Design a protein around this ligand. Structure first.
Ligand SMILES: CC(=O)CC(=O)SCCNC(=O)CCNC(=O)[C@H](O)C(C)(C)COP(=O)(O)OP(=O)(O)OC[C@H]1O[C@@H](n2cnc3c(N)ncnc32)[C@H](O)[C@@H]1OP(=O)(O)O
Ligand SMILES: CC(=O)CC(=O)SCCNC(=O)CCNC(=O)[C@H](O)C(C)(C)COP(=O)(O)OP(=O)(O)OC[C@H]1O[C@@H](n2cnc3c(N)ncnc32)[C@H](O)[C@@H]1OP(=O)(O)O
Lengths: 430, 430
């Protein structure tokens, strides 16, 4: 087994409605300057990743590139992101010399798990001998359509034939449906989900890259007492179980990471104990059946399978973790992710949230920079953002949201669709 | 280096307008039954692949699944094909036991090179120790939109912002644009491309899986002598250089392959010298810049890079090949692929086609079952179909289009976009 190391990476600001970085009718530059395109975000991500990893001027030592992206063919009319990434180093300098020419590249997809699947592909390439240094980048632009057209696009992650009819906001409806069953079993409550949102927004207020950085929300606002916090679904069966503040943001952004094996480190002139490295101890993927849903909506079975495989392969227990990043696409999902990861037992996520165990001051901080709720959710980027967030904490780089006790062990859990794809990784600080 | 073996596979009939298998006004079942959906095609492909590979009843020994698909999100409103593949063994049998539950799965994409990229991802998993048996499947449904809407969807493979404006049929226009430069340099002629189509259709007439199986074309109906073979492009600059018979078909279908390492063969009860096997000696991927095109339209630089890497890794020369499958998305591309692969020198593909060298009776038969022109082109399936076509000839399984001499060595060359992604493999018979 060849060891795999994160050498460095980059996360863009995540932007959309409500960010002062987003150009809309309220913005000074409206009509004069535009928001970044998918191509521009990909170029900023690739370049920033190479720069932060020490590869500027020697990008030719990267052996291959993997791009995670979910819906570029719909939001930007652009597939084939492999060769877009090959062109990203020199984007806008037509005819410049391009050290990535002719290298392997491809795009991987598994809905919001696309970024995590990109890291898996990159790692297989490292362990198979076909690469010693790999670039994995995840990007998404979703702000180019209305929220309602965007909802139909996102519904590509569901069993579209079977489930699109639930609601124009198909995904929010699928999680409202879970939350209804959850509330009926008293597994946890809408108050508890309001506590998740309060935590996410307080964390994002410490994070200048966060979509909702400037938005301050109290527990009371998240719990439905602000009348701007609407129960917005059309489906009358499920609409009482999802507020706006329960939902991840519609964001644009990118995240990238450079991965290396022991031979890659040697080429870069680095030792395996270099203080800039994090080891990926394990990574695992589990996928369930798109066409059939388990009866027990209180459990994310697929996410749990992936987390168990990863922790087992790394030979650690959930109680060994010092930090985690989980797929909080709704407040509802974070709670379930506590239990999928195993930092709470089944029915005890509510204990963790009521006691502050996952806050920055808690014994197991989760989603320290705002998660999908506040940091934002450019779908393809998210799995790589999670990895880089853990890396940033382990390297002391998080500024106002830096954990005081540098974490030795971390985990990520990245989910696609209604718990149909899951990717989980265990990271160990060097 | 772990060796990789093709254990078996399956190709569906490829269907669309002009096939008696396509349900349209001419078909007995018109109005009563519908053409297969993407889900149904994926289920038929996964089940057929398992069946032909000897895995029926033991599908649990498959460690992972990779799906090639380009445009399901547009043509079928469905992404996230990983969990669709997990549900494909038991499709339509709700509640049945599913030995693939929780295995890794993902979708990979690189336009028409998606099927080839799927094979590469599967092979990296086999060589990395995370898998011993893998399933790679490629599927596409494009008959759900008109050929013109479909053209806009296919333009996702181009630099959409830069190139969509050429023509509604963006890809046919990019290849017409090549052909104009090609014709001006006398590199080869429209007569030569007509000879490619005559070959493809005669091959497809021997192949019951072919989209154009029942369509017989004389050379005169390929060479523009028949005015009903229309020059259909809107762009006046390029419209003279492309006839309908020059174009790959808009098809629906699937192809699958089971791949194994030495450990996988052991699990299956097979020896590495078993007569059902074909070794994949090498596979390689090269990707160029989406945003910039080379000046020399007479050369497919990216395709040539991938073929050279694969031949070199296998330690063979082009003159050692007994059979090949190349990416004939237009008659124009087949000609250029002869020279990318190296079975002709630059400017000499025309010699091969004028002398019959790539016919079934020739010294190096290419696209023996009709290629993308007659077999058809469900884009995600194509890379895997190519592999399976070489396999089928090596195993004597091609019936009316079986070669005169069993091939010992074969190659494939699969391309995405306008020579932006290329995947090439070398196969050796056992
Ligand atoms: C599935 C996995 O794998 C895990 C995942 O990743 S799932 C992916 C999760 N992501 C998503 O689904 C995106 C979720 N988030 C969202 O869609 C948005 O954040 C929202 C939650 C939709 C945000 O809303 P917004 O940005 O303010 O946009 P907006 O245009 O106002 O849309 C809200 C809708 O609610 C209603 N609404 C909003 N404000 C309202 C008010 N004050 N009064 C009444 N109704 C209101 C409206 O009907 C509106 O749509 P219409 O104008 O078409 O009616
Ligand atoms: C992107 C990647 O990476 C993938 C690749 O490998 S590259 C992409 C390769 N694939 C393609 O580009 C698809 C190419 N093929 C096609 O679009 C179609 O097969 C084809 C247009 C060549 C033939 O299509 P068809 O469906 O048999 O005929 P039909 O669909 O009835 O009409 C096709 C068009 O031909 C023309 N046509 C047909 N009959 C005609 C007639 N009697 N008179 C004039 N024009 C006629 C029309 O222009 C028609 O389109 P519109 O009606 O929209 O104007």
């Amino acid at each position: 087994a060849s060891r795999v190391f994160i050498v460095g990476g980059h996360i863009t600001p995540f932007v959309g409605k409500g960010s002062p970085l987003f150009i809309d009718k309220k913005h000074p530059d409206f009509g004069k300057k535009k928001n970044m395109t998918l191509e521009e975000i990909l170029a900023t991500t690739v370049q920033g990743t190479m720069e932060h990893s020490g590869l500027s001027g020697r990008e030719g030592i990267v052996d291959q590139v993997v791009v995670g992206n979910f819906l570029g063919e719909l939001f930007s009319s652009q597939g084939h992101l492999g060769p877009a990434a090959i062109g990203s180093l020199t984007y806008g300098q037509a005819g410049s010399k391009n050290p990535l020419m002719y290298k392997p590249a491809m795009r991987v997809e598994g809905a919001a798990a696309s970024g995590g699947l990109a890291v898996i592909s990159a790692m297989n390439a490292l362990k198979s001998g076909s690469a010693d240094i790999t670039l994995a980048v995840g990007v998404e632009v979703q702000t180019t359509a209305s929220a309602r057209v965007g909802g139909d696009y996102l519904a590509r992650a569901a069993d579209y034939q079977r489930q699109r009819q639930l609601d124009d906001f198909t995904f929010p409806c699928l999680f409202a449906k879970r939350m209804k069953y959850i509330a009926e079993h008293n597994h946890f409550t809408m108050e508890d989900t309001a506590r998740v949102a309060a935590k996410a927004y307080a964390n994002g207020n410490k994070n200048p890259l966060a979509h909702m950085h400037t938005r301050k929300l109290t527990f009371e606002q998240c719990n439905g007492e602000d009348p701007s916090n609407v129960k917005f679904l059309g489906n009358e069966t499920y609409k009482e179980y999802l507020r706006m503040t329960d939902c991840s943001q519609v964001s644009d952004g990118g995240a990238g990471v450079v991965l290396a094996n022991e031979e890659g480190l040697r080429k870069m002139g680095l030792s395996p104990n270099d203080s800039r490295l994090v080891e990926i101890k394990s990574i695992a993927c589990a996928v369930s059946n798109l066409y059939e849903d388990p009866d027990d909506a209180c459990c994310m079975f697929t996410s749990r399978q992936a987390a168990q495989k990863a922790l087992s392969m790394a030979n650690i227990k959930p109680s060994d973790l010092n930090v985690a990043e989980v797929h909080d696409c709704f407040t509802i999902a974070e709670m379930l992710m506590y239990e999928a990861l195993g930092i709470a037992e089944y029915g005890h996520a509510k204990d963790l949230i009521r006691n502050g165990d996952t806050t920055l001051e808690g014994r197991i901080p989760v989603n320290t920079g705002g998660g999908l709720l506040s940091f934002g959710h450019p779908v393809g980027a998210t799995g790589i953002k999670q990895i880089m967030e853990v890396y940033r904490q382990m390297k002391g780089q998080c500024e106002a949201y830096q954990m005081k006790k540098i974490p030795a062990l971390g985990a990520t859990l990245n989910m696609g669709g209604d718990d149909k794809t899951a990717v989980s990784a265990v990271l160990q600080n060097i």
